[model samples]
Target: VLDGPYQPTRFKPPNDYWILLSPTNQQVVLEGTNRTDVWVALLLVEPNVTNQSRQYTLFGETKQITVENNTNKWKFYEMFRNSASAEFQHKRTLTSDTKLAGFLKHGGRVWTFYGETPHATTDYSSTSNLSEVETVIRTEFYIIPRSQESKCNEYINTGL
Candidate 1:
């Protein structure tokens, strides 16, 4: 289950979703102004046990990232707002037009992690207590120097 600010049961995925396969670690470049452009990645998995009861287990990770030009403007919240659409698109790939309507219509927890933590150590537990075991998926996007661009002035523009 999610232990965060907003409960996921309060939301839903969009309709007519598209599926994008993710590499263990792959790079996807965004081609808009750094201010308007955002990059995201997603993974889909099915977690289950071999027990006869067929217990339900959480699957997949949704990661959303926005690349911003540090030379222009700066604010984490603004970056998130401008990148919300891309973020939603990343989340939509996992399911169909399924809305979260209380516990009946929707009842599952999907996590989206931000950063560069390796997936190998994120999947299983190493501690004595299994209670804290959690899955991890890292999402990252940042501004980088493009050799094609001429003057440094172009680097500060909203377009990457």
Candidate 2:
């Protein structure tokens, strides 16, 4: 549902960090975390006409290229560099609800990222407890659907 070349609204990160969220709220790119030049990008895939099966894809950086998964589980296709080929090289899959930990190593230290379910709340611009680096990132990037139309209306009417 995103138009081309959309400029996302910037959310002030803790310290001098920078965060960019897509206008449709489906993609997020983070940079300059805690004064380190650590860059992280996450893409959320949902069920749609192109992807009818409820499979989701999250792509980002890694040291080596790989692929994981089967038809019964969520699949992941990771690559270190972008390419313009149709080959399915380095594909990976998640057979269960997996915890992303110690996946990427930087400067001899392991870095892990965690994701959680999202809930409707006040606008990100008005929240006070979400000033932390991770909180800010998740608040602006994580997407969750409402269980019913009334819940969606309530969220909109509550100023989100």
Number of the top TM-score candidate: 2
- 20-122, model 1: which lDDT tens digit per residue? 1121222221111122322222322222212122111112223343332222222111112124244332222111111000100011221222221111111
Cand. 2 Cα-lDDT: 0.25
- How many residue-pair clashes does candidate 2 contain? 9
Q: Which stretches of candidate 1 lie over 4 Å from their true place?
A: 1-35, 49-81, 84-90, 95-160
TM-score, every prediction: 0.16, 0.24
Q: What's the TM for model 2?
A: 0.24
**Candidate 2, residue 153: CA error in Å?**
22
Using lDDT, give the best candidate's number: 2
Q: Write the per-residue lDDT of candidate 2 for residues 126-146, one digit (tens) a residue.
A: 112223223123223322122
